[PDB]
Amino acid sequence: SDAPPLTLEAIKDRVLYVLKLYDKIDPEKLSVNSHFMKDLGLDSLDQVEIIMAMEDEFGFEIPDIDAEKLMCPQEIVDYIADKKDVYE
Amino acid sequence: PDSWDKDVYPEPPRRTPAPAPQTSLPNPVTYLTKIFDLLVDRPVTLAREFIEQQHAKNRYYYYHREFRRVPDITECEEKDILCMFEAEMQWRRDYKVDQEIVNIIQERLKACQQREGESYRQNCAKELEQFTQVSKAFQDRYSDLGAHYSARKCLAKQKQRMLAERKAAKEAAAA
Amino acid sequence: QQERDPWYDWDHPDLRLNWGEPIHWDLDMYIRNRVDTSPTPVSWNTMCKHLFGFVAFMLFMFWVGEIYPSYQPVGPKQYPYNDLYLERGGDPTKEPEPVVHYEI
Amino acid sequence: MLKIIIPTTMLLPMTWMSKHNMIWINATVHSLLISLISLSLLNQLGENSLNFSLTFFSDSLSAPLLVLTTWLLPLMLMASQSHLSKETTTRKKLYITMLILLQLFLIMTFTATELILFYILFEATLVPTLIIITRWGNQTERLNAGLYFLFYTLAGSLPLLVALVYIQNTTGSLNFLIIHYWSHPLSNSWSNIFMWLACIMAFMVKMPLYGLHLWLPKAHVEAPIAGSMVLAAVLLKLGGYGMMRITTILNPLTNYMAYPFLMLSMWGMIMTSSICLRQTDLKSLIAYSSVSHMALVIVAIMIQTPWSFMGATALMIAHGLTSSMLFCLANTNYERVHSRTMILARGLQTLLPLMATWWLVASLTNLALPPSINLIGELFIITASFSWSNITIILMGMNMMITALYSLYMLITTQRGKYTHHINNIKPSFTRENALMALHILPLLLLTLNPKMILGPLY
Amino acid sequence: VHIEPRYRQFPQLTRSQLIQAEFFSATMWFWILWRFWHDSDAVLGHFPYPDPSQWTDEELGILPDDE
Amino acid sequence: RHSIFAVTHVLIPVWIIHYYLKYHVTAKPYTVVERKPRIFPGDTILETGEVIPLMKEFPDQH
Amino acid sequence: MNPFASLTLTTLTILTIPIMMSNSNIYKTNLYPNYVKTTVSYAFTLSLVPLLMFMHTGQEMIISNWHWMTLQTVELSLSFKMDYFSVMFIPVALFVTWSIMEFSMWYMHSD
Amino acid sequence: SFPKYKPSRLATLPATLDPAEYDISPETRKAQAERLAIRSRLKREYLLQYNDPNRLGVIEDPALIRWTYARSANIYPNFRPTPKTSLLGALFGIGPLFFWYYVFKTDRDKKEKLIQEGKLDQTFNISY
Amino acid sequence: TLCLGAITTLFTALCAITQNDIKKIVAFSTSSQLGLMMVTIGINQPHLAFLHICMHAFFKAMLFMCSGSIIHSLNDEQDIRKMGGLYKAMPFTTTALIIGSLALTGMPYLTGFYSKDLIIEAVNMSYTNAWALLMTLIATSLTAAYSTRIIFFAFLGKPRFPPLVLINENNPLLINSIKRLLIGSIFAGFIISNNIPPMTVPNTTMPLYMKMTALIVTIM
Amino acid sequence: GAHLARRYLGDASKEPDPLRMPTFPPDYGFPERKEREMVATQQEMNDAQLMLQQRDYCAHYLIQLLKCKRDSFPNFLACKHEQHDWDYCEHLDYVKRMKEFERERRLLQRKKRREQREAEMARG
Amino acid sequence: AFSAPAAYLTHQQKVLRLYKRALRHLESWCVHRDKYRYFACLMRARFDEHKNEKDMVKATQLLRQAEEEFWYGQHPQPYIFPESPGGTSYERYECYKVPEWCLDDWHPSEKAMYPDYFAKREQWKRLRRESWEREVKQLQEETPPGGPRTEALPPARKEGDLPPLWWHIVTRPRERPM
């Protein structure tokens, strides 16, 4: 039929996967609760690039006003779940 | 069929070619024609036969109404209301008859153009002349009367036309 | 209404309005099913100039081509029976002047 | 034809003697029966009219108008009983009495043999309409609307009366048959010019003509639903019927007195079609639509050709049905949301799909979709005008465009888009409303099937 | 026919679709080649185009610049 | 149940249309008009039996 | 009686049957798209026959079957022209429509 | 450096290209804060009634009523006969009528004059 | 009519070669073909115009179905900038679209050849406007141009769609419909042209260079 | 194409005009010319109902091709020889038209040059 | 869409939005992935070249010049995601969204089907009815006397409170309702 029912576990897996392919982030040092600003030592432009990578991964655009606030992979997973009405 | 007069609605004598096969292949048109005949034309014919048999057991007739001729608007006094009423009714009936005549001629023209095919411009010349003549007569009779037309207005138009043609004839005579 | 921010949670998402704010006098003209005033990548009166120039050039060139036609180096088509006099309208009681075509 | 007149005067005491909870049922049933009885009048001759007696006669032009009136009365009864639930019994009986009197007045008006009796009934129709508008309307504007409805008519109709009696002092009679048979040309004098104006201006106001139309939006917006139905469907057609009757004695003056009226009609057709594009009120859009269609009918009657007369009759009938249906459709939404603003309730197709279908059919019929009798009338008038002058097809063409636009605009503004979030009192459509729209629409297509019944005597 | 998503790998392909695609491409090319072999005139033209410069005056009947 | 579709959707409408054209539309003149068939040299007419002569001894530019 | 006219009218008339069945207990099920596609394919196969007749002979007809109304001298009737253009475009349009409907049975499944 | 973009009535100036936004002052910030506060107050007032369980019907919008009343019933009281108003009214209400009258009168006079001379080719012109 | 057709076909072909929505490109191709049809009417060849209508129906409808198959495959995505290497992922769709583009461009002995080739040869040998002839030639070059654009951006190169691969065309309905329209777009030209009577006078004598004009401009 | 460039850039006085052509008598340069003949009578061409534009001097081959096509209906690939013959007759007609155009061009240029030479001689 | 807007945008926010728009339009211009990566690295270098300017006047001047350059060199037909405000599926499914209160008008025969669903609906309605007054009282206490100054809303703080004005946000129809 159409696309399978995207689940929270799949969203977290994809977010972590795309994050672990970024050269400026160590794979092992990354956790689902890692902060991009404090823990990771990235600047604002790196956050913008990560947000665009998320959009390209999931095929939909995140508005800027909602995009600036996201700072950890858990926030990204929650935002994608709420936008897509994923409950399981 | 005999439903309509074949003189009012004339037709050519319907010449058609005989079929001359030239290939050993079968003609699917003939096979489909046979299938259509055997599957459609026979049950339809039987139903029609039954319906006509039922109709024949109860035969009654309707008649065409005949109207006599009454004095025209010319033979009517200025205020004789009854004679004017009768003349006006007669005029309206004649107007309807003339309209139907023009319609018949138009039907002749339309049928002929289609029937002729690619030679209609030459073949249909006879129909075209008849339509032109009847159209000219109809236009001289009833055109430009407008709404609220009557026998008096048609009479006035005719009188004006005859006055004009009499003047033209008298002026041409002196030439 | 097209120029308004599409990512804001408007009270009326379709009309892009909020409850209580003043309504433009010509709102029904600007309902975004209608006249749009949003900025364009190419400025006005530059699109106008290009479009008018294209249309005027095409019209003038078509006129020129009409006055300077293209054709093959051939004579006119020849038809056997007096240019098919009887075929294009008949009139068989007029004795039309004979048209004759010769070999070449 | 007292077989139609007397049953209505019997509807009067039957309504005034019925039980408190059976007024609507009895009135609707017997008005439907009277409409069925009146259906027999469509059997018209090809030469003359049905001359029943010295006082009443029926022609092929007035018979469809009588049938439409008798068909409209039960529809008005069905549309009125929703908003009249809280009224007292006596006031409901008075409302039904006013509607019955209006129908009786119209029935005698469309069949009077003399011009004076026709004038008397044509002016008597004012009182029930004024009472209804000024008493059962909703807002405070109704009073002003009533005044605009009344004097606009009388200032145009009072001179006509004088003209009428003057004619009887000259010709000796005002019977339509004697008038038609003893017609004489009108000379070229100032006296004859002013007689022409006196005979024409009343019906010009009743259509209404552009520039004389300012009473119509007020009257048709501020009146109750049955008032709006009867004003748009039948009362506008009195002017057209009267002009058709009276133009028999005005020739050949009309040949040059029709110019300013023709120019006003065409340009005002364009102007009102343009006004309909920018309207914040849903009822005013339908009112200005009515003005445009009546301008078309005015042009048709003025050019005075058999094709134009046929198109005028067809367009009159079709517009009556169409405008009544559109008014009912708007009234349903008004009863749901208690506001006439068009952009207030949007996306109604999601919540009311069958009502969306009714809206679609009404709008398609409004823009003259073939082969509806709307298009038949419009196209006949267009061809007659083209014969009158080849340039007319420009203006008519513009209208033929603009109309469609605003029609679809209305539809897309109300049925499409997304629903208004804060409006949550939109209940499913009742059977009464669906039956009302169905009874409005089915006769339109049925008459499309047999279009010779509404093409007038010139057919 | 059940095919699952792949996530950055080549999609799963069934033999039927490749067979159909190859057959139809081959039949298009066969038809083109066959028709070109048997109906070449429709591409290269059928009759030679004559050169008016190589027509003598005897057949064109133009007088030799005297009369 | 298997091929009832071809009966209730093809056979019945064609029966009704054949009836209506054969006995009602044809009953009035000029309702069904067909263009005349093409006649070529070497043909024989079905009704009259007349044969059409050949074509004027071709030049035979072989 | 010259099956050209009957087949040409039947091709047009059988396309309207699902429109009348739209208020029946087939519009409320999930078999309606298949029913419509089958109807259009049957119509195409029926229309393939008058094309063959024209190709063999060259038959052209006009059928003025219903007389709608008549003006003073202009008569309006329901007439169909079944010349070369009609009998050639109808099968092609029906074929394309059949293919498009079968494609839509897959494209618009989630609608 | 690059070609300039000049806005029009039907193609306005982009927000990022507006000079008046790149030169800001504290009073501009105060104005923006006041605008946001007004908008937030209106939004809260709307949302209180929007989420009310006991609310059944349509929340009246005074803005819509004001717009409709201004567009319809407030026009005549605020009308004054001025040279501009009088000139526009006379032009747009009289000029089209006389223009079309001249056009149609000229067309019909030419047609009638041709008719009198007997050269209009009215053959087959039965219906009118 | 001829001038209107020429301007329409040229303008639409010129607008098509830069579009990024595949549906918009096919729409502009349809408009250009309609302009060519109007040009054919303008030179007194209505039967050729009808034949072109019948010919173009097939491959235009099948091209739109192929585009729709691609769109439904990649989660309702219509931009060609985000459709990558589908030559091997969608073999049947690729085959069908290649055949349809070849037929549209007047490839010899296919469906679109038997109408468009005759149209070009008929406008070449007519007493006609020279500007219209030039615009018809430029438009028939731009036709091949935009077909090349579609094929190159949609079916060649590396993938550019989102990584969650949902490509699947193994459905009997889609395959059957496209196969029917494909058989049509391969053979209908020959079948119809050989089975209709000659309603036109043919152009038998033509210069060799003018005969290959359409082929030359298409290849360029 | 070259004739177009010759007429539209060079001397158009000696170039033929397709609308006004021929401007010379048909028997001017020729001593005797055979009247072009027809093989199909008007009646046969009418019964065949070819077209008004197909009734040229090559109508007989078209008539035979149409007759064979009607006779050989189910085999739509058997009408090749007569189609070739009709194509050949049309090609001959086109060649004759080209010959007429060349004749007119040569006659026009020769006549104009000869008149110019006569005027120059008389002016000396 | 979910977050309340502020009174104004900061300079850093403007620069970040310009960066995102420039990268997206450059990707629109550079179709292929490797080319996009190359010129994206170049654009990032251009952006972080002036990252350390202490003069805000010159920073705003550079932002102005960059905006002008972007407007001149923008793609006339940029790539838009299918469900973005300019996309080909932006408001596609808005016609399939029906508010929940419509279920209140269902016939009893219709509600006879799905009994458990309507039992849960009754539970949710009771929850809303009990929580309304507490939400109203919380809104009044938190808000400053001079009216609210932002569109933000406070969360729940007490034992069993709910965030005020939650019903219409929580009971959204769906993103793919039908």
Ligand SMILES: CCCCCCCCCCCCCCCCC[C@@H](O)O[C@H](CO[C@H](O)CCCCCCCCCCCCCCC)COP(=O)(O)OCC[N+](C)(C)C
């Ligand atoms: C908001 C819209 C309201 C409705 C409008 C109703 C339209 C009514 C207009 C009446 C139509 C014409 C009236 C008279 C017919 C001719 C008018 C005049 O222009 O024609 C010339 C008239 O010449 C001059 O105009 C003299 C008349 C001048 C006095 C009339 C006043 C004109 C000023 C405009 C006032 C606006 C009137 C409406 C007020 C509301 C012809 O010259 P002449 O051949 O000798 O007269 C013919 C009559 N004969 C044969 C008996 C001799």
Ligand SMILES: CCCCCCCC/C=C/CCCCCCCC(=O)OC[C@H](COP(=O)(O)OCCN)OC(=O)CCCCCCC/C=C/CCCCCCCC
């Ligand atoms: C013959 C008399 C009339 C001739 C026409 C003259 C011009 C008519 C002008 C009509 C004005 C109508 C105003 C209200 C219409 C409704 C509002 C409306 O349509 O909105 C505009 C809407 C939105 O624009 P989009 O680009 O789709 O944006 C969507 C993405 N955001 O688009 C439109 O519909 C605009 C249509 C107006 C076209 C007017 C210009 C056409 C001129 C054609 C003249 C050429 C004649 C051709 C001759 C052919 C040779 C014989």
Ligand SMILES: CCCCCCCCCCCC(=O)SCCNC(=O)CCNC(=O)[C@H](O)C(C)(C)COP(=O)(O)O
């Ligand atoms: C495809 C066509 C369009 C391309 C045209 C566009 C090209 C424009 C290129 C030039 C743009 C610039 O350099 S504009 C450079 C502007 N200069 C400054 O901002 C200096 C002060 N520094 C800061 O504001 C922050 O450190 C900040 C830099 C935001 C980092 O933010 P974070 O670290 O906290 O995330």
